[PDB]
Structure formats: C-alpha cells, structure tokens
Amino acid sequence: XWXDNXXXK
Amino acid sequence: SQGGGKKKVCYYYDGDIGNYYYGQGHPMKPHRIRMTHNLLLNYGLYRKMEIYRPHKATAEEMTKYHSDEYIKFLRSIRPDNMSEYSKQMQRFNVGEDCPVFDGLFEFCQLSTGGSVAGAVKLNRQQTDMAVNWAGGLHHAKKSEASGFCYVNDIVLAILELLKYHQRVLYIDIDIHHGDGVEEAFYTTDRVMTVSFHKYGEYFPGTGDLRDIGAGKGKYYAVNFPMRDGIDDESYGQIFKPIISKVMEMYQPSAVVLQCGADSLSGDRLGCFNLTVKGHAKCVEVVKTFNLPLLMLGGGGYTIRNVARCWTYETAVALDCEIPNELPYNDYFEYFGPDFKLHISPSNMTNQNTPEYMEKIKQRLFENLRMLP
Ligand code: NA
Ligand code: NA
Ligand SMILES: [Zn+2]
C-alpha cells in the first residue's frame, strides 16, 4: 500500500 | 411502511483516536478522523445525531474471528521490545507496511469498539444507521496484519449482525479490494461481499472478476475490477444498477458500507478521479433501500479531502444539506486554498471506457442470476 517495488504494498 | 423518512443516526468517536501516530512518512494518519469530527461539529451536525464514545473492544471480542496467537501478539508488541518479537513480527506481517507504534492495540480497540457497538445498536433496533469513521479496516486477516489494518473491525461487526440477521450485505467502495472481509465470508452465503476497486498491479492484488466465492458461498462474492481515472459519471452508471440487482437477488436484512476515501481524486495513494459528491452518491443509493446500515471508514490519504468526504457523507446520512463554504474549525488551514467543502476532479484520463464498464457489469449480472 505504501510504496511500490513489488507486491504492490 | 413505505421506505422513506429521515433515519436515526448513531455516531461513534473517541477524542483520543487522533493522537495515534503510525510513524514519520506513513500515509495512514488517524488525525484525519479528528479533522472529520471537528469539521462536522462546526457544521452543527451534532444536533441531528446521537454521538457515542465507543468502548475498547477486548481481546475476547477480537478472537471471535482472529486467532488467539495473533491477538496476544498485538497486546504484547511495543516499540521497546521489537527485538524479542522479530520472528513473530514477520509471521504476523507487522513491521513495515503495518508498523509497530505506541498504543497500537488501543487504536485497534477504539476502531473495533465503534464498529461492534454500532452493530449492537442496530441489532437492538435502537438506530437506523451507525457511523464509525475509525473503522473499515478491510485488509486485516485472521492471523496477520495487512494494508495498514491490524484488526478487521468489519468482520467482527458483521459477525455481530449475524446474530439477528440471516443475510448481511457488505459493500466496499475503497479503491483497494476488500480482501480481508471477502476472505472471511468467502465460503458462506450468509454474507455477500461486493467490492469496487482498482485491479492490475495494485494492492492487494486480489479481487478479480472471476472471484465469486467457493462452497456454499459461490456467487456470493462480487468484484468490479476498475482501471485508473474513473470519474463520478462512470462510477454512478454501474454502482446503482449493480447494488439494486444485489438487493433484489440477495435481499439482505442488514447492510455494511465501507466508505474508503482513497478512491477520491487527488488521493496520495489512489488513482481514481471521484469527487465528494460522486463518492457520497454511493451512500445515498445504499440509503434508499431503508435497511439497517453500518457506515465505516477505511482508506483515504489526502486527509483534507478525507475530512471533506466523511463530513458530507455524514450529512447525507442525516439528510441535512450543508453549505459549500466551510465553517471555521481547528484545521481551517488544511482546506486551503479554496476552503470549500466539495472538490473538483483532475484532468487525468479515464481508462475505464464506457463499454468496459458495461461489459464488466453485464458479466456480474450473469453471476447474480445464479442466486435462488
Ligand atoms: Na473496494
Ligand atoms: Na460470502
Ligand atoms: Zn484503500
């Protein structure tokens, strides 16, 4: 959810 | 009875909810709930609804869904003893996206307490609607945290409604997929979960059109995948017909509506192009069916628009028209440079073609036809 770099997040 | 009239609203808020801090740079700001509360007070909306302070939900109330091992970890973990729980932090998905902060468990108690108390107030038929903007944490799983959510207050509040309601309807207009609520009731027909969300290289990566439930819950999970930049007109063209078709086929006796504001235009994490009026249109559509309704919060990370959205949606629930000129409040500078209640959409491209919206809706009606 917060940020990018895989897994969405 | 005919399905109308002004509804009684019970509003849940704890003045300490705005002091919990996720950490520097973290987009989840519980201060937005205090801004929302202070804004609707200066609008005078406290005269039209009953304001309650929620209790702190105990670990016993949370274990009605969550595992004992996961809840006991939430009571124990603190910023001063993270080194001892470094293994348990990874097991329960705590430390990065869902960080450890001071009063973490208390924040979960206040957020959950408002939701379960609203469900009790609805079960006892002492209100028509219950509002808990601190709730709506739709990502929390049975034994792990996710998407800034630690305890899934929605699942606990719906389990409370299932004591007196045979069928409960969950609607999720957060820009992210309501995976936690959908997973909890994926194999039962007593709860139908309807989620509108962005799909494709986006958190949490679930919510495909072809996810309709399993077992006895097959065709009782509805997901509308969307692309970037959807506006009020495209969103309103599909929400009302799909919700109307769900009410006809499923016929619930209670409704839970998660009103995540991160689907608004200009959200720090969202990429939709909705306005407050387009977002609040979903509230008054669900409201027209005159069923016991629990309104919860959720996402929303441009906090000045979050305070706008949930204040207006509270007035919509109260059927009270409030002026676009924002009254003075303790956070008046947050709403510059316009100091208006309603927002305007951006010039971003709506990648949701009208034919795409019509095709996804048509395939969802096929699934709804498989209900008894
Ligand atoms: Na959603
Ligand atoms: Na279900
Ligand atoms: Zn979200």
Residue numbers in the entry:
A (entry chain F): 500 to 508
B (entry chain A): 8 to 379
Please quote the authors directly.
To address this challenge, we develop a computational “anchor extension” methodology for targeting protein interfaces by extending a peptide chain around a non-canonical amino acid residue anchor. To test our approach using a well characterized model system, we design cyclic peptides that inhibit histone deacetylases 2 and 6 (HDAC2 and HDAC6) with enhanced potency compared to the original anchor (IC50 values of 9.1 and 4.4 nM for the best binders compared to 5.4 and 0.6 µM for the anchor, respectively). SHA can coordinate to the zinc ion in the active site of HDACs. In all the crystal structures we obtained, the thiol functional group of SHA coordinates the catalytic Zn2+ ion with a Zn2+– S separation of 2.3 Å in a distorted tetrahedral geometry reminiscent of that observed for the inhibitor Largazole.
To circumvent this problem, in design round 2, we built up macrocyclic scaffolds de novo inside the protein pocket to increase shape complementarity between the peptide and the HDAC2 pocket, and to make additional favorable interactions between the peptide backbone atoms and HDAC2. We also incorporated a Trp residue as an additional anchor that lays flat on a hydrophobic surface close to the active site, and mimics an aromatic ring observed in the same position in several small molecule inhibitors of HDACs. The macrocycle chain was extended from the SHA-Trp dimer, and the conformational space of closed macrocycles harboring these two residues was explored using generalized kinematic loop closure. The best tested peptide, des2.1.0 had an IC50 value of 49.3 nM, a four-fold improvement over method 1. To improve the affinity of des2.1.0, we mutated a D-Lys7 residue adjacent to a hydrophobic pocket in des2.1.0 to D-Met. The new des2.1.1 had an improved IC50 value of 16 nM for HDAC2. The crystal structure of des2.1.1 matches the designed orientation for the two anchor residues, SHA and Trp, with the position of the water molecules retained. While the electron density map for SHA and Trp are well resolved and match the designed model, the rest of the molecule appears to be in a conformation different from the solution structure obtained by NMR and the designed model; however, the electron density is too weak or absent, and the thermal B-factors are too high, for those residues to enable a meaningful comparison. This flexibility is consistent with the observation of multiple states during conformational sampling.
